[PDB]
Design an enzyme around this catalytic site. Structure first.
Site, PDB file in Angstrom:
ATOM      1  N   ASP A 142     -16.846 -41.784  -0.324  1.00  0.00           N
ATOM      2  CA  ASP A 142     -17.059 -41.521   1.090  1.00  0.00           C
ATOM      3  C   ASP A 142     -17.207 -42.824   1.869  1.00  0.00           C
ATOM      4  O   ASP A 142     -18.293 -43.420   1.889  1.00  0.00           O
ATOM      5  CB  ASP A 142     -18.311 -40.645   1.255  1.00  0.00           C
ATOM      6  CG  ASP A 142     -18.617 -40.302   2.703  1.00  0.00           C
ATOM      7  OD1 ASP A 142     -17.780 -40.597   3.573  1.00  0.00           O
ATOM      8  OD2 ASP A 142     -19.705 -39.720   2.953  1.00  0.00           O
ATOM      9  N   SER A 182      -7.390 -47.893  17.131  1.00  0.00           N
ATOM     10  CA  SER A 182      -5.981 -47.540  17.128  1.00  0.00           C
ATOM     11  C   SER A 182      -5.364 -47.868  18.479  1.00  0.00           C
ATOM     12  O   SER A 182      -6.008 -47.766  19.523  1.00  0.00           O
ATOM     13  CB  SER A 182      -5.802 -46.045  16.814  1.00  0.00           C
ATOM     14  OG  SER A 182      -4.445 -45.672  16.924  1.00  0.00           O
TER      15      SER A 182
END
Length: 330
Positions: free
Chosen positions: A35, A199
Site C-alpha cells: 500500500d 498530472s
C-alpha cells in the site's frame, strides 16, 4: 541487494493485490496488501480477537525465534474508507522476494474492522508511503522500504500491477524489459506523507487533451481512480446511459455500453487506461448496472491515482534524497 515478488489480484475485478511476505524464524508466509498510501506493516495474528479472524493466515510471534516485543508500543489506524485496526508491535525479520530486513516493525493486530475480517484473502498491509505517516506510538517506526533503502543497489521500488493478471513489485532495480518507451519522471511532494505529484491533464477516449494540473497521490492500496468532479463528469458524459447514483454512491453504467479509454498526463508523456480497466462489474449479482472505475474525489479531499490508473503503467517509486515518481507505458 534487490528483491522481486509477484503480486496477484485477490478477485476477478482486481479489487486489490496480494504479495507473499516471509515474517520471522522459521518463516511464516503471509499475503499482504502492498500500500503506497500508508506506512504501517500490520498483520492478522495470534493476538487478533478470535471472532474477527475468518480464514486469514496469522502471524504468531511466540513461534518466531527472532521476534522481540517492542515494549510499550501500540498502533492504531483508521483508513480513508472507514476501515480500522489496532494492536501492539514486535520487531522481526521480514523478507520480500529475496530481500531481507532485520528488526522490521511488525504491527500485530488485536482488533480489526469488519471489512478486514470479511476479506479472507488479505492477511495484512505492508505500507510503502513515507515513514512520517507511521502510527506506532510512542516511537514512530520505519517502513520496510525505508529500512531496506541503504542496502538496495538503487534506492527505488517499482510497481507493475496486472490487469486481470499477476504483476510484480521490485526493490532496488529497474527492470528495463518490463516497459515500453522511456520512463518519464515527475516531482513528488512528501508534505502529506504520500507519493504526491501533479498530472499535467487528461483526455477522454480519442478526445483532445485538456492541459490542467491535477494534484494527487500514487496509491497502490486504493482500487479506483478518484479525480475532480469536473473531470469525472466529462468522462461519464461519453458513456451512454451512465448516471451518478447517490444510492450506489457513484457513477454506474449499463454493461452493454462501450467504455472509452482515459488518458492522464505525466509531464509531456501520456498514460492510456483502456476502457475495460474502468469496468468493475455488476453493482449486485445479476444486475445489469455496472460500477465505474473512475469516481469523484469530492469529499475525499485529495485525488487518488489508484490501481485503475497505476496498472496501466510501470511505476517507479524513487526514494532518492529528493524523491520522484516515474511512469512508463507497458
Amino acid at each position: 541487494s534487490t528483491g522481486s515478488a509477484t503480486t496477484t489480484p485477490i478477485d476477478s475485478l482486481d479489487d486489490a493485490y496480494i504479495t507473499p511476505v516471509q515474517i520471522g524464524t522459521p518463516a511464516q508466509t503471509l499475503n499482504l496488501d502492498f500500500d503506497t498510501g500508508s506506512s504501517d506493516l500490520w498483520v492478522f495474528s495470534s493476538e487478533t480477537t478470535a471472532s474477527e479472524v475468518d480464514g486469514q493466515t496469522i502471524y504468531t510471534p511466540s513461534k518466531s525465534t527472532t521476534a522481540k516485543l517492542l515494549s510499550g508500543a501500540t498502533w492504531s489506524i483508521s483508513y480513508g474508507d472507514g476501515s480500522s485496526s489496532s494492536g501492539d508491535v514486535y520487531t522481526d525479520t521480514v523478507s520480500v522476494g529475496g530481500l531481507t530486513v532485520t528488526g522490521q516493525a511488525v504491527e500485530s493486530a488485536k482488533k480489526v474492522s469488519s471489512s478486514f475480517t470479511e476479506d479472507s484473502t488479505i492477511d495484512g498491509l505492508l505500507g510503502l508511503a513515507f515513514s512520517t505517516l507511521n502510527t506506532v506510538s510512542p516511537t514512530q517506526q520505519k517502513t520496510f522500504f525505508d529500512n531496506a533503502k541503504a542496502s538496495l543497489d538503487s534506492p527505488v521500488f517499482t510497481a507493475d500491477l496486472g490487469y486481470h493478471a499477476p504483476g510484480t513489485y521490485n526493490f532496488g532495480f529497474i527492470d528495463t524489459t518490463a516497459y515500453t518507451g522511456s520512463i518519464t519522471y515527475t516531482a513528488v511532494s512528501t508534505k502529506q506523507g504520500f507519493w504526491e505529484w501533479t498530472s499535467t491533464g487528461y483526455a477522454v477516449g480519442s478526445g483532445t487533451f485538456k492541459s490542467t494540473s491535477i494534484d494527487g497521490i500514487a496509491d497502490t492500496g486504493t482500487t479506483l481512480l478518484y479525480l475532480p468532479a469536473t473531470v469525472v463528469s466529462a468522462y461519464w458524459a461519453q458513456v451512454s446511459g451512465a448516471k451518478s447514483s447517490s444510492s450506489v454512491g457513484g457513477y454506474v453504467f449499463p454493461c452493454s455500453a462501450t467504455l472509452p479509454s482515459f488518458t492522464f498526463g505525466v509531464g509531456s508523456a501520456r498514460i492510456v487506461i483502456p476502457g475495460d480497466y474502468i469496468d468493475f462489474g455488476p453493482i449486485s449479482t445479476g444486475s445489469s448496472s455496472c460500477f465505474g472505475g473512475i469516481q469523484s474525489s469530492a469529499g475525499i479531499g485529495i485525488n487518488i491515482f489508484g490501481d485503475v490508473a497505476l496498472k496501466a503503467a510501470f511505476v517507479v517509486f524513487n526514494g532518492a534524497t529528493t524523491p520522484t515518481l516515474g511512469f512508463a507505458s507497458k
